[PDB]
Structures are given as structure tokens and as C-alpha cells.
Design a protein around this ligand. Structure first.
Ligand SMILES: CC/C=C\C/C=C\C/C=C\C/C=C\C/C=C\CCCC(=O)O
Length: 133
């Protein structure tokens, strides 16, 4: 079910990421670097466990999780959140909860590209990733 998401992906398009970061309270200087960074996302599976790495020149993250099982996460911007990832309509849906807030990170495969939609408050950011061979 998750296999078409697996592999190494590089950022090729971003829309409204500054809006998303600002909604989360990220400071100007961090927004400014993040607007010029092109991360690599690596998604791998070992049995039921998925590991999602995000690498860049500015910040790295790594999470491991089982679909449908809550996990603690410390985000790139240092939020301590309660997270869960599932599959819904073929999309990989990641929900983060903290301080009564929520944000969703939804990944959809369209014509072999990985589209990441980030929503917080009213802000909606769309980032497009293409697969590395
Ligand atoms: C490790 C993330 C990689 C590059 C972006 C650069 C800096 C992160 C700092 C602030 C961004 C704020 C929010 C973090 C939450 C989600 C961003 C995920 C973006 C993505 O995977 O393309």
C-alpha cells in the first residue's frame, strides 16, 4: 500500500511555504533560508516501520513510525507534537497535534511526482517532489 511513496525525492516546486511557516510562528530569518532550500526526502520501509528522512543544507529531520500508531515527534521548527500517519484515498496523511493546534502534511502521487500539501490555520502550501533514480 505505501510502496509507490518509497524512495528518494527532491524538491522541484514550492507554493506558499512562507505562508505556512509564518502561520506556525517561524521567525523571518528561518523562513528566509527555508524559501531558498531544496530538501531531499527519503522514505524507506522495513516491515511495518516507515522511516522518513528530510535532508537539507539548513536542517535535517528523521522520523520512524508505524501507520495508524501515534508517535512523539520534534519537528524541524522544534515543535513537540503528537503525530499519526495513515493512508486515506491512497494519500499518505500525517497529522500533528500540539497545544490544541493541528497541522496536516498530505502526500499524494500525481503522474509519478510526490505532491506534499501542508495546511495550518488558513495557510495551504503545495510542494512538489520528483524521484531520484
Ligand atoms: C528538514 C526540513 C527541510 C528544509 C526546510 C528548511 C527548514 C525548516 C524550518 C522551518 C520550516 C517549518 C516547518 C517545518 C514543517 C514542515 C516542513 C516540511 C517541508 C518539506 O518536507 O518539504
Amino acid at each position: 500500500m505505501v510502496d509507490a511513496f518509497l524512495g528518494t525525492w527532491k524538491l522541484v516546486d514550492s507554493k506558499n511555504f512562507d505562508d505556512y511557516m509564518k502561520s506556525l510562528g517561524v521567525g523571518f530569518a528561518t523562513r528566509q533560508v527555508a524559501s531558498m532550500t531544496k530538501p531531499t526526502t527519503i522514505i524507506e520501509k522495513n516491515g511495518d516501520i516507515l522511516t522518513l528522512k528530510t535532508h537539507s543544507t539548513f536542517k535535517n529531520t528523521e522520523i520512524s513510525f508505524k501507520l495508524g500508531v501515534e508517535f512523539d515527534e520534534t519537528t524541524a521548527d522544534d515543535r513537540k507534537v503528537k503525530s499519526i500517519v495513515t493512508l486515506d484515498g491512497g494519500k499518505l496523511v500525517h497529522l500533528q497535534k500540539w497545544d490544541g493546534q493541528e497541522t496536516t502534511l498530505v502526500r499524494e502521487l500525481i503522474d509519478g511526482k510526490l505532491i506534499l500539501t501542508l495546511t495550518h490555520g488558513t495557510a495551504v502550501c503545495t510542494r512538489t517532489y520528483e524521484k531520484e533514480a
